[PDB]
């Protein structure tokens, strides 16, 4: 055994007395003395002695000794001697059922801590020992063992459900179920809590005893103890997700039970009971089994959506829980509205009409929340009531209480689509005017709500925002001086969404003069590796696309930062590929948006981006991105490639020899987005290159013909394929000519549905040069070529002559009598168009 030294022990007791000193200036001096002894082993051997052996000391003094020992395990267990731990673990299990509730708790937290920091495999004699303490005749020993077992089950769930401890769950789980019928409520609650840890994981030991579990759950249904109710509720909620089949026959009994528990006195029990409705609603059998309970369920949920008296104080002046009865009831009501749709209206409509116009703001606020929660589902049914509710809600935007104002913003944004469909002078105009007011609200929460609601309204209004663009920009710009932290990020979203809505209408000198200077300021002040950079990155990306040529005086610092982010991202990518454990993995999202912004500048600024391209390694980095394993990265790279090809090919041309083999291997139709941009890339390159395109053709030509022939291919992909093929045959027809008969069918089938733009023009210029070389392939399928040529409404005069020569060359080859019967299968507009526009 081990015996302590009295003199050393006396100073340890002194250290415990100094730790209990009320003065704050003394507590810091003793912690430094303990920190030195903490590193010293054998010191912990003294602490465990004071806790258990030394019973001549105060209960808080002994307990403090055991709790200091706990903190040493949480930090220095990697250095704990094997001789010491064996004594501590032996001393704890001998006092696991101490008479003193304070001592029993201290021993309890020690045992679970050793099994937490130190792995369970290092203490194999713990589990079978604890189970043997459950059958103990002593009560406190039983409780102490269960209290420890529950914490172990909570900490290490996956460990117990593995071959690490030789499957200890096959003994404990059947053992726990036998304690559901125990006398003490603390023991009964302990048992349920342990089993619940293995419901979702579908533990074999529990799944084969599922019938014994459910039967024992129903036995505890009418239990008065809240802690027991809570775990039973948690049990049924989990069981509802994994074993629906075994609950279905008893479903109606459960629903009536949960309905009473949702209305329970203790909010903790009600919250766990409320989770049932949220999980049940996402089941394909809900609509049938719950329809008989809807009249009773709806008012329960609505009543639970009110702010509690405790919540109101915490909000005035996040500061509240991330999840409570309010949010849970509201979430359940939302999904329920999506299940029954309009069938939920007779149960909610009469409730709303009392809530929305109630005098108590707390009651009124809840009604507004309800009205927004059922918006998505009961949309088509709320229509007749919207002409009354919407103007009322707009009035509620100027309510005295802030919590009423903020929720009204959200609820209004839920019905944003209907507002836009109506005449803008009736609903849209006052809504927009009042929202802009609430953006500059004094209350921070209302600011967030209004700015979020306005952003939602922008996606629905789109071009309807133009007549208000002057007022909108004034409000948003001014918000920069007020908005900080969480309020600032939402503001970027409101600005970016605006740019994606008004489009080129934003491009005006007075608008740019207000919007850009505060944006560039934030663009420079913000450091890298910041969580405020990304929302601004997406913001400017939208603005650059909208402003187009107006972004030129501000493109310099934006271009450089984007190139830097791409380079920095590729840097961390290499470090993570070589030493994954030592270096953090990079976030590709910052690089993808950066590439998209660069692609936006290349397209928006055109040839004015030429100088910035040469003074940077944008093409070198681009070469690396095209080889990345992530599809989204390769997609945004090829897009940037094609844009720079049109912007400034004189800087791109040197790197064509290396880009082409990459583009040729990325023509995989598996990745639609990547394949499309790649196909479009080589097309734009083919134009700038010219006759110099010949050595790169045979490695991509066979690829394109394959793609344009494969069935179930998306419309946009077939278009860009046909356009590219035609573009290849325009500069170098000789290599594409013999393939003409192979792709002549889907080429005309696809490009007959597109408008007469530049892409179509260059494509048809290529199909004419190839026909002039190989007129053979077009003969067999000439009916498709005629339909494709007739698709042209206003072709260029030189392109018209090309069409005319081919048509006349064909008519003078087969004869007139062979041309009439050939044109008898032509539709009415097809035959008349060719006969007049081309005179054939």
């Amino acid at each position: 055994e081990w015996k302590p030294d009295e003199q050393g022990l006396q100073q340890i007791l002194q250290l415990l007395k100094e730790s209990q000193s009320p003065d704050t200036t003394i507590q810091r001096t003793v912690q430094q003395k303990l920190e030195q002894l903490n590193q010293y082993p054998d010191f912990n051997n003294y602490l465990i002695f004071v806790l258990t052996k030394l019973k001549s000391e105060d209960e808080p003094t002994r307990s403090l000794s055991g709790l200091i020992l706990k903190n040493n395990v949480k930090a220095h267990f990697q250095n704990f001697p094997n001789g010491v731990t064996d004594f501590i673990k032996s001393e704890c299990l001998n006092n696991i059922g101490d008479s003193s509730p304070l001592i029993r708790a201290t021993v309890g937290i020690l045992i679970t801590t050793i099994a937490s920091k130190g792995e369970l495999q290092n203490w194999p004699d713990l589990l079978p020992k604890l189970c043997s303490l459950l059958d103990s005749e002593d009560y406190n020993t039983c409780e102490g063992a269960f209290g420890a077992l529950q914490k172990i089950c909570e900490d290490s769930a996956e460990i117990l459900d593995s071959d690490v401890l030789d499957r200890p769950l096959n003994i404990m789980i059947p053992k726990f179920l036998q304690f559901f019928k125990h006398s003490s409520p603390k023991i009964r609650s302990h048992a349920v809590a342990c089993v619940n840890q293995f419901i979702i994981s579908r533990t074999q030991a529990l799944m084969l005893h599922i019938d014994s579990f459910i039967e024992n759950l129903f036995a505890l249904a009418g239990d008065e103890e809240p802690e027991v109710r809570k775990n039973v509720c948690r049990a049924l909620v989990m069981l509802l997700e994994v074993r629906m089949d075994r609950l279905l026959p008893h479903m109606h009994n459960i629903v009536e039970y949960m309905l009473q528990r949702t209305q329970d006195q203790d909010e903790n029990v009600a919250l766990e009971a409320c989770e049932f409705w949220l999980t049940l609603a996402e089941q394909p059998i809900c609509k049938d089994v719950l329809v008989r309970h809807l009249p009773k369920l709806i008012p329960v949920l609505v009543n639970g959506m009110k702010y509690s008296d405790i919540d109101i104080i915490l909000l005035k002046g996040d500061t509240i829980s991330d999840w409570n009865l309010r949010k849970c009831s509201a979430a359940a009501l939302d999904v329920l509205a999506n299940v029954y749709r309009d069938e939920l209206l007779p149960h909610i409509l009469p409730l709303l009409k009392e809530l929305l116009f109630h005098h108590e703001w707390v009651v009124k606020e809840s009604g507004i929340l309800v009205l927004g929660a059922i918006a998505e589902g009961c949309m088509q049914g709320m229509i007749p009531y919207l002409p009354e509710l919407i103007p009322h809600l707009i009035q509620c935007l100027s309510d005295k209480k802030a919590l009423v104002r903020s929720i009204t913003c959200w609820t209004l944004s839920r019905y944003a689509h209907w507002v836009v469909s109506q005449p803008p002078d009736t609903y849209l105009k006052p809504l927009m005017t009042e929202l802009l007011k609430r953006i500059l609200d004094s209350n921070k929460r209302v600011q967030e709500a209004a700015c979020s609601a306005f952003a939602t309204l922008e996606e629905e209004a789109c071009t309807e925002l133009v007549p208000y663009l002057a007022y909108i920009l004034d409000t948003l710009v001014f918000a920069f001086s007020k908005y900080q932290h969480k309020n600032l990020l939402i503001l970027y979203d409101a600005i970016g969404t605006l740019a994606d809505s008004v489009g080129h209408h934003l491009n005006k000198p007075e608008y740019i003069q207000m919007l850009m200077p505060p944006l560039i300021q934030k663009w420079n002040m913000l450091k890298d590796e910041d969580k405020d950079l990304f929302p601004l990155l997406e913001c400017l990306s939208s603005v650059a696309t909208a402003l187009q040529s107006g972004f030129l005086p501000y493109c310099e610092p934006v271009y450089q930062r984007c190139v830097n982010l791409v380079q920095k991202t590729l840097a961390q990518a290499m470090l993570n590929n070589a030493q994954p454990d030592q270096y953090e993995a990079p976030d590709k999202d910052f690089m993808i948006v950066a590439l998209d912004l660069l692609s936006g500048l290349a397209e928006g600024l055109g040839g004015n981006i030429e100088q910035l391209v040469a003074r940077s390694n944008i093409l070198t980095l681009m070469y690396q991105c095209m080889q990345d394993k992530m599809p989204e990265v390769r997609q945004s790279s090829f897009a940037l490639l094609g844009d720079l090809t049109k912007a400034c090919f004189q800087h791109v041309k040197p790197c064509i020899a290396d880009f082409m083999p990459i583009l040729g291997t990325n023509l995989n139709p598996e990745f639609i987005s990547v394949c499309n941009n790649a196909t479009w890339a080589i097309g734009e390159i083919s134009i700038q290159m010219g006759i110099e395109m010949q050595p790169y053709i045979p490695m991509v030509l066979h690829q394109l013909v394959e793609i344009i022939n494969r069935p179930n291919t998306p419309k946009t992909l077939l278009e860009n394929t046909a356009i590219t093929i035609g573009r290849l045959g325009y500069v170098c027809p000789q290599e594409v000519a013999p393939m003409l008969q192979q792709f002549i069918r889907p080429w005309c089938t696809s490009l007959r549905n597109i408008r007469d733009n530049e892409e179509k023009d260059s494509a048809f210029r290529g199909i004419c040069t190839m026909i002039s070389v190989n007129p053979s392939g077009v003969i067999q399928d000439f009916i498709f070529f005629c339909d494709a040529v007739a698709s042209w409404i206003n072709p260029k005069d030189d392109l018209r002559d090309m069409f005319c020569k081919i048509l006349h060359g064909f008519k003078n080859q087969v004869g007139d009598e062979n041309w009439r019967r050939f044109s008898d299968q032509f539709p009415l507009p097809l035959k008349e168009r060719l006969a007049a526009f081309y005179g054939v």
């Binding site: 949010k327 509201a330 979430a331 939302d334 929340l369 927004g372 929720i407 959200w410 967030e448 709500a449 979020s452 952003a455 939602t456 990020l489 939402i490 979203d493 929302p535």
Partner: peptide, 7 residues
């Protein structure tokens, strides 16, 4: 989540 929800 970029836009605040009461849920």
């Amino acid at each position: 989540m970029l836009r605040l929800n009461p849920y």
